[PDB]
């Protein structure tokens, strides 16, 4: 893990959608987060803020908020990629923008967390290709015709039987003195 | 006297899967709350253990994983075994990415009856060429090793002779992570091999190690040379990422005047070259610790 | 319909099963669980359960206390043993009311593994022989043979 949720936010003192990559507890540590967030802290501006050891990730896009947490340190950029990149997939992932569209590609969207994002780690690129892993497979399907075939024979013939039937070292030395 | 819940029910066998995808939202809503009472659970066992609808099946599992499982009911609802047969099959299923996102949902899921024969069944799956596939052992591996880790008890070396099997980096990667968390040991003994090596690797496995080396220190020492003459090859040092491990690491190491001089540098120029101003007043942070 | 497979079925009752799915055999672990498969035929598409009468197997299946449409009981006609003992449970079937809504065969399955008994024999002794309020003309199969197997069932769907 890197991330024990993403959610995704909107400006509304909520945050549009999330998930919950470990329960034990409930909202409030979400609830709660909820909570503040929707207040911002009347604080101005600023795309992070980490307080107390928490990285409060985010990312205005527009009157929405792409939203990460984290606490210990990490390397930036390709944090920002992240949201940057959220900011790249959605109109294709659950539609365009507006909470209902992903209302009803929640499935989907949460599924992108996933996938995307194994536990902190930026699993690939290429969107589409995304797609291709699940709910958009091959290996069934190629597997299926053949072998429903088969079955299907001993069925049809069933259906008759039934039918009828140097520079280390400088360092190294200066060191070791 | 009647309810709803059967309205939902012949929704379902109007559409079919489309209605019933209805109904999953209309459920999961329901669910969301917490809420539902029971008996849809009967049209559900009754019509999916006979079903495919792929998608709402992976609705319905994951309905099944975020909701409770330990159910009132016993623990399971009491069929956690015989519908798993299928299922089991599925993770069996020759289908690797089927198996796969099963496995996604396995590393979520942890129903122990039904794992002990799947144990065997993963174990089968693991030599699947696909590297999603084994991955995703990797994760549910590690959900194991908390929950019953036992359950399998031979695995670190299992896995380290596998390591020797293995060449997909992202599979490595996540090898080590892993690994570490079982015993360091492994990865050491691996880690004197790969000295040489690693400069010419990619980074993210790299990474991990730099964490753990960390921990055992200041617990006790002794061992330096064999790392020394790595670490000095990682003083190339060169990603951005690299270099900002690669002198935080150090500092954590040292701070021989000479050390704290070649961490300073790697600092100044970075900062230099450094753009995301919020980053700036990190470092700063630290040195301000420093 | 509902059509029933029960008995334990890990013992190539599954075997029986998947010689009829795909013409295979268990290649499976011995199966505890509802196995699953529709026949098409009269277009009532048979939706076997082929349960294993193992313990909480057996014991549970509640929810598939509803209502009874077509019997097999796929045999271990070396079997010749819980069947006394299967007597004695049959009862609580007889004892349902679902149960009577089905017009069936009992199927004796492993002949060529091992033997087999009179068809008569086993009549009586799972207390078959006293059924009428279902029909109950009687079909021999083996796991390895079985045929005329329809015209028990012939008669059973347009009971």
Redesign the interface.
Same mark, same amino acid.
């Given at each position: 893990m890197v991330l024990l949720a993403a959610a995704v936010c909107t400006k509304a003192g909520k945050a549009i959608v999330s998930r919950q990559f470990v329960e034990m507890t409930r909202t409030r540590i979400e609830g709660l987060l909820a909570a503040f967030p929707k207040l911002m802290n009347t604080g101005k501006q600023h795309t992070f803020v980490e307080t107390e050891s928490v990285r409060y990730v985010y990312q205005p896009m527009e009157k929405l908020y792409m939203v990460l947490i984290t606490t210990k340190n990490s390397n930036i950029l390709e944090d920002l990629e992240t949201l940057r990149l959220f900011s790249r997939v959605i109109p294709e992932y659950c539609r365009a923008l507006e909470e209902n569209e992903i209302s009803e590609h929640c499935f989907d969207l949460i599924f992108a967390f996933d996938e995307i994002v194994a536990l902190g780690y930026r699993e690939n690129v290429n969107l589409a290709q995304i797609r291709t892993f699940t709910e958009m497979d091959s290996h069934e399907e190629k597997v299926f015709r053949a072998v429903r075939e088969?079955?299907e024979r001993?069925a049809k013939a069933?259906m008759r039987?039934?039918?009828?039937?140097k520079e280390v070292d400088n360092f190294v030395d200066k060191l070791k003195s | 006297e009647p309810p709803s819940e059967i309205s939902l029910k012949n929704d379902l066998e109007k559409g079919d899967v489309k209605s019933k995808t209805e109904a999953l939202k209309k459920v999961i809503i329901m669910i969301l709350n917490g809420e539902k009472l029971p008996g849809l659970?009967?049209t559900i *066992?009754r019509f999916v253990?006979?079903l495919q609808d792929h998608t709402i099946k992976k609705l319905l599992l994951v309905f099944w994983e975020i909701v409770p499982k330990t159910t009132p009911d016993g623990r399971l609802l009491?069929?956690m *075994?015989?519908?798993?047969?299928?299922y089991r099959?599925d993770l069996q299923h020759p289908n690797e990415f089927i198996r796969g996102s099963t496995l996604r949902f396995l590393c979520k899921l942890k129903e122990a009856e039904l794992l002990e024969?799947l144990m065997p069944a993963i174990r089968a799956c693991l030599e699947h060429r696909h590297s999603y596939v084994r991955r995703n052992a990797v994760l549910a591996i590690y959900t194991i090793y908390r929950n019953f880790e036992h359950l399998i008890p031979d695995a670190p070396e299992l896995i380290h002779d596998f390591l020797v099997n293995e060449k997909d980096a992202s599979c490595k990667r996540n090898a080590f992570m892993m690994l570490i968390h079982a015993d360091q040991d492994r990865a050491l003994d691996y880690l004197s091999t790969c000295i040489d090596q690693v400069q010419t690797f990619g980074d993210i496995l790299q990474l991990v190690i730099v964490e753990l080396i960390y921990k055992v220190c200041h617990a006790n020492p002794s061992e330096r040379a064999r790392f020394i003459r790595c670490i000095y090859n990682l003083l190339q040092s060169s990603s951005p990422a690299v270099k900002y491990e690669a002198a935080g690491t150090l500092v954590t190491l040292s701070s021989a005047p000479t050390a704290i001089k070649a961490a300073a540098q790697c600092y100044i120029d970075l900062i230099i070259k450094e753009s995301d101003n919020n980053v700036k007043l990190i470092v700063l942070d630290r040195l301000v610790e420093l | 319909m509902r059509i029933l497979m029960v008995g334990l079925d890990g013992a190539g009752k599954t075997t029986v099963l998947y010689k009829?799915?795909?013409?295979e055999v268990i290649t499976?672990?011995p199966?505890?669980?509802?196995?699953?498969?529709?026949v098409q035929?009269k277009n009532i598409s048979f939706?076997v359960w082929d349960?294993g009468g193992q313990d909480?197997?057996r014991s549970?299946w509640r929810?598939y206390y509803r209502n009874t449409e077509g019997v097999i009981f796929v045999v271990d006609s070396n079997d010749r043993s819980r069947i006394g003992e299967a007597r004695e449970v049959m009862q609580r079937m007889l004892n349902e009311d679902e149960l009577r809504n089905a017009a069936w065969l009992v199927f004796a399955n492993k002949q060529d593994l091992p033997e087999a008994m009179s068809a008569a024999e086993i009549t009586e002794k799972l207390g078959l022989h006293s059924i009428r309020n279902r029909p109950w003309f009687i079909q021999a199969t083996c796991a390895t043979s079985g045929?005329?197997?329809?015209?028990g069932?012939e008669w059973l769907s347009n009971s």
């Open positions: 088969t079955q001993e069933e039987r039934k039918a009828k039937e | 659970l009967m *066992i253990l006979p009491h069929e *075994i015989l519908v798993c047969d299928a099959k024969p | 009829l799915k795909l013409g499976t672990i199966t505890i669980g509802f196995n699953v498969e529709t035929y939706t349960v909480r197997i549970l929810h045929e005329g197997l329809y015209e069932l």
